Subunit: 183 residues, 4 copies
DNA sequence: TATATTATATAATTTATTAT
DNA sequence: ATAATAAATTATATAATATA
DNA sequence: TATATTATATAATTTATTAT
DNA sequence: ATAATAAATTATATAATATA
DNA sequence: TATATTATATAATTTATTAT
DNA sequence: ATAATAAATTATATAATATA
DNA sequence: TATATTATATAATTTATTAT
DNA sequence: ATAATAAATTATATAATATA
C-alpha cells in the first residue's frame, strides 16, 4: 500500500502533466487567433492609399505579383494607359467602401492658428507671429483655447464607432477586391 | 475580453504548473522514504553474521572505523583477547534479539534424501545412489514426495509473521547496539 | 576495459561540451542585449530634434517623479513660468547647436516637378492639383526627365552615411551637456 | 556591423555545438547500452553451469511460449518422459564438455587449517567444531602460518584472468552448439 | 538555492573456502 | 551442516556538480 | 519519427532444501 | 561436494507511453 | 510528427519629398 | 492641405530547422 | 543565486492638429 | 516648412515571477 499510494500519486502527476500540455496548446491556438485578429484590425483602420498601377496589374495576373509589375514596366504607352484608367475606376470604387477617420478638434495654439489665420498670409510668418502672440497670453487666456471635456468625449464616441465600422468596411472591401472583374 | 480570456487561461496554466511542481516534489519525498523503508526491511531480515573483532573495536572508538581496525591489527595479544571476549559476550547478547528464518519443508528428491539417508554413509555416494533410485520412480511415486498445499500455506503464514517480527527485532537490536557499554 | 574507457571519455566530453554550450547561450544573450542597446542609441542619435517641453525641463532638475514634477510646474505663477520658459529656451538654443539636421534626399518624380515648376500660388491645394494635371499630361519620357540621377543618389548615400556617423558623436556631446548642465537661469 | 557580425557567428556556433552535444548524448547512450550487453554476456559466460531442466529442454525445440511448453512436457507418459530425459542428458554431457569449471582460490586461514588437518570423522559438525577449537587455541603466529602466500594469490590472479577470458570463447562455442543442435533423440 | 545526480570516501555484509 | 577469516561485494554517508 | 522510459510479460538463473 | 526440484529472484523481450 | 522557431522569399504599405 | 512616385519599411507566406 | 521572463510603472518620443 | 500642445505610442526602469 506504500507503493500503491506512491504509484497513485505518480499517475495523478502524469494526468496533471497531460492537462497542462493541453492548456498550453489551447492558449497557443487562441493566441494565434488573437494575433490574426489584431493584424486585421490594424489593417482595417489604416490610412487608405491609392493602389499603384503595377500592383493593380499583378492583382489581375495569376502569375507572381513581382514579375507582373516587372512586365508592366516594359508595357507600351497604350496598354499602360488602359490599365491605369481601369485602376483609377477601381480606385474610386475602392475608396467608396471606407469612412475617413474622425479628426479631433483644434486645441490650444492649433486652435489659435485656426481662429487668427487670415487668408493670404505667409504660413511660416503667420505661425511665428501667432506664436509670439500666444506665448504672451496668461494661463487662463490659453485655457479658454482648449477643447471642452464634452467635445473630447464626443470625439471618443466617434472614434469608437469608427473603430467598429472600419472592421465591417474592410471586410466588404476585401470581398470587393476578390470578386472585381475589370469590365 | 479576448485578451482577458487568454490571460485567464495563462494564469490557470501557471497555477497548474505550480501544482504539478508540488506533486513531483511530494512523490520524490515519499519515494525517498519508501526507499529508506525498503533498505531497512532488507537489513532486518538478512542473515545474522558474527561481528568481526576489528569492527567491534571500531564500534567502541569514536575515531573513524577503518583506522580503528588498523590500530586493532597492531594490538598485543592480551588486549586483543580482552576485546575478543567482550565481542563474544556482545555476540551472544546480539544474536539473542533475532529469530531464525522459517525453513521450508524438504520437497521431492530432497525429501527422498531426508527419508532414505542412513547414518554413516558417503554423502556423495548416497546422493548419487538415491538419485538413481529416484529417477526410476514413476511420476505419481514422485508426486507423493511433495509437500502438501496445507504445509505450503503454513510455511507462507510462518514466513509472513517472521517478515513482520524481524522488523521489530531489528529495531530492538539497533537500540541495543547504540546503548551497549562494554562493562 | 576499452569499452568503458571510451565511454568515460565521451561522458567527460559531453559534460565539458555542455558547459561550453551554456556559456555561448549566455554570451549570445549578452551580445544580443548589447547590440540592442547599440541600436536604440544610434536610433536616438538620429531622430528628429523636438524642443523640450517646459515641464520636462523642470523635471530634469528635480530628483522626484516626472509626473509630480510637471504637476508642480503647471501651478507656477506667470512670472516664474516665464523665467523657466526663458531658461528652457536658452537650454534649447544651446542644445540644438549640438546637432546637424538630417540631409534630405533630392526631390524625385512629381516632387522634383513641383520643386522645379512651382510658381507662387495663393491657393496651395489648387496649385498642387494644377501641377498634378501638368505632370499627368506629360509623356513617359517627359516624366522620366524628372527623376534623380544615379550620381545624386550616391552622393546622398555618402551624405547619409557621414551623417549617421557624426550624429552619434553629436548625441554623445549633447548628453555630456545635459548631464553637466546647471540650471543657472 | 561587427557587433551583429560577431553575434551571428556565435549564434551559428551554438546551433552547431548543440547538434554536437545531441550526438554525443545518443552516442554515450548507445555505448552505455552496448557496454551493458557486453557485461551481461561476460557475466553469463562465467556463471555456475546448471543442468538444464527437461521442461526447458522441451521448450527449446518448440517455437511456442515456454510456460505452455513445460506444461505440455509435464503430461508426458513415462516412456516419452524417459526418452526426453535421455536426450536432455546427452545434450547436457555435450554441453558441459564446452565449459571449464572455475579455478578456486586456495584455502586460507581456518579453511586451510581444515584442508591440511582434516582427518576422517563420522560426525562432520563435531569434526568442524573440534578443528575450530584447535584453531582458536592457536597463537597468532601459529594462525599466521595458515594463510596463503602472495605467490599463491598472484598465481590465482593470473588463473582467474585466463579463465575469465577463455569462458567467453567457451560460451560462444556453446551458443553455436545450442543454436545448431538438432534434437535427434 | 533547494534538490536531483554523481562520485568518491567509508563502513557494513556477503562470499569463498576448506570437509562433507 | 558444523565454523572462522580476508576479501569482495554491497551499501551508506558525505562532498561536488548540475539542474530545476 | 528515434528514442528514452516504463511496464510488464516471458524466460533464465539462482536459491533453498535434504545429509553433512 | 555429490543431485533434483519448486520457488524466488533476476534478466531479456515485447508492448505502451512519452519526450525529443 | 504536430507545432514553436526561424528564415528567407514575396507582397503590401508607409515614408519621403517637393511647396506651403 | 492639396498629389504623385520609388524607395523603404513593414507585413505576410512559404519553406527549413528544431523542439516537444 | 544569475538570469531569462514578465509586468508594469515611469519616462521619452512621436503624433496629430490648426493653415497650407 | 513655420510652432505649441494634449494625446498616443514607444522605450526604459523597476519590481515580481520563474526557470536555470
Amino acid at each position: 500500500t506504500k507503493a500503491i499510494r506512491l504509484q497513485k500519486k505518480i499517475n495523478e502527476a502524469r494526468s496533471a502533466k497531460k492537462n497542462l500540455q493541453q492548456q498550453i496548446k489551447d492558449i497557443s491556438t487562441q493566441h494565434k487567433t488573437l494575433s490574426k485578429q489584431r493584424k486585421f484590425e490594424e489593417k482595417a483602420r489604416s490610412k487608405i492609399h491609392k493602389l499603384a498601377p503595377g500592383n493593380f496589374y499583378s492583382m489581375f495576373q495569376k502569375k507572381r505579383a513581382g514579375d507582373s509589375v516587372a512586365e508592366f514596366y516594359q508595357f507600351p504607352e497604350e496598354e499602360k494607359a488602359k490599365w491605369i484608367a481601369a485602376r483609377d475606376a477601381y480606385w474610386e470604387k475602392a475608396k467608396s467602401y471606407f469612412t475617413p477617420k474622425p479628426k479631433l478638434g483644434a486645441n490650444g495654439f492649433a486652435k489659435y492658428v485656426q481662429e487668427n489665420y487670415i487668408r493670404g498670409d505667409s504660413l511660416t510668418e503667420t505661425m511665428k507671429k501667432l506664436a509670439d502672440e500666444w506665448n504672451a497670453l496668461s494661463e487662463t487666456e490659453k485655457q479658454q483655447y482648449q477643447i471642452s471635456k464634452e467635445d473630447k468625449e464626443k470625439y471618443k464616441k466617434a472614434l469608437e464607432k469608427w473603430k467598429e465600422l472600419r472592421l465591417k468596411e474592410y471586410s466588404d472591401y476585401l470581398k470587393f477586391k476578390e470578386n472585381y472583374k475589370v469590365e
